[PDB]
């Protein structure tokens, strides 16, 4: 039982005002803040003067009070003027190769104004891997108009699928995710008689 901690380099300098972070960017959770020593140490030199800052489900206090972190119900952090936002893309700088998984089934969705359509594939009632696809950005953006049709087709019926994944880039859309998400570069329907899945 755990969560994926976003790296420190994704911190946005221009925070979102009153909860509206700029497009292609998402707010930050308190759990993801309590697990980054480098981010916390860096943050101490940026928040002086009795200030208060908002989060997705909490509230952050400035250096005058001592940097205490307090929990709150969801949606309670946007009442304040300043909010923390984090970019949702990450270039790993790693060689690309064909990676794949088997016997998966799509069960989840996510979208925004200028963001990817993402899904979570589950085997035997447990999450396995996540995938995303965009029509505006990325190396494989031209395949959105083609992959979306088959994605919708496999959503409506419980057909088992084999999913192809590229690991040149990583995505951090789903907050407090217990799994990794990568790009999507292929879909193949299962067939046991031909030894595919």
């Amino acid at each position, epitope marked *: *039982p*755990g*969560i*994926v*901690i976003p790296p420190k380099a994704l911190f946005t300098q221009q925070g979102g005002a009153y909860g509206r972070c700029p497009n292609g960017t998402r707010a930050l959770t*308190v*759990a993801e803040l*309590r*697990g980054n*020593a*480098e981010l*916390q140490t860096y943050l101490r030199q940026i928040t002086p003067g009795w200030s208060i800052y908002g989060l997705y489900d909490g509230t952050y206090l400035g250096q005058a*009070y*001592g*940097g*205490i*972190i*307090k*929990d709150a119900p969801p949606g309670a952090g946007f009442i304040y003027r300043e909010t923390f936002c984090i970019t949702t893309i990450y270039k790993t700088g790693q060689p690309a190769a064909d990676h794949y998984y088997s016997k998966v089934t799509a069960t989840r969705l996510l979208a925004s104004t200028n963001s990817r359509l993402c899904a979570v594939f589950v085997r035997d009632g447990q999450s396995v891997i996540g995938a995303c696809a965009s029509p505006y950005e990325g190396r494989y953006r031209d395949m959105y108009d083609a992959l979306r049709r088959l994605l919708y087709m496999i959503y409506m019926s419980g057909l088992a699928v084999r999913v192809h994944v590229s690991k040149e880039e990583q995505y951090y859309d789903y907050e407090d995710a*217990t*799994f*990794q998400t990568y790009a999507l570069t292929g879909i193949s329907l299962c067939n046991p008689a031909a030894s595919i899945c």
Partner: antibody
Amino acid sequence: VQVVESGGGLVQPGRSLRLSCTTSGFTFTDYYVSWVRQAPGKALEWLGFIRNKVNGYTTEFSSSVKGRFTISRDNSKSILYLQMNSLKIEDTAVYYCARVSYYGRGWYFDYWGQGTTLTVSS
Amino acid sequence: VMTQSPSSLSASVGDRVTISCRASQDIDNYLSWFQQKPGGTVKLLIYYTSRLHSGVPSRFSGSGSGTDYTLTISSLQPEDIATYFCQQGNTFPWTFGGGTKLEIK
């Protein structure tokens, strides 16, 4: 679920050493493990921990020993190693390696082992 | 910085006993207690506030909020003689308490 440490003894000033922390009973690639110190006339101080597989095996260190004590994993043997580039007189203590869990939104220790003694003298 | 009181305390079998451990500022209910018998093994008793870890008998309990949190023992038995500690988990780095020695008359 248990964990046992081995190694210690006498290390001269300016000399390096590495310890051990061997685990059994739990899936080694899923959980967080950490290190603790206990000065003879003082309380307990925290050193650092290594993350699990999903987080990509990254490590965090305390400011007291930054850039001196590294942490490495060996999944094929389920052994934890702790290297010490330099040692001084003030570093004599009993060393513990411990596990870390995750609740609703937090982290807590749940097992500790048995401990070992390391001494620096001339 | 973190402190405890009393530094030492002694009682008898059947005496309800409480230990006061406090912090310098708000910690948002992140205290964990530990028990260290003379043999050197260190076990966990309560990890999140007022919830009992597996294997610990229902005698132990805790309560509190803000800066003050108190551990309570229903009754002391011959197997309870040890040293106790309180640890915070809100912000890195974590800090431990000074410990309390509890004898039996």
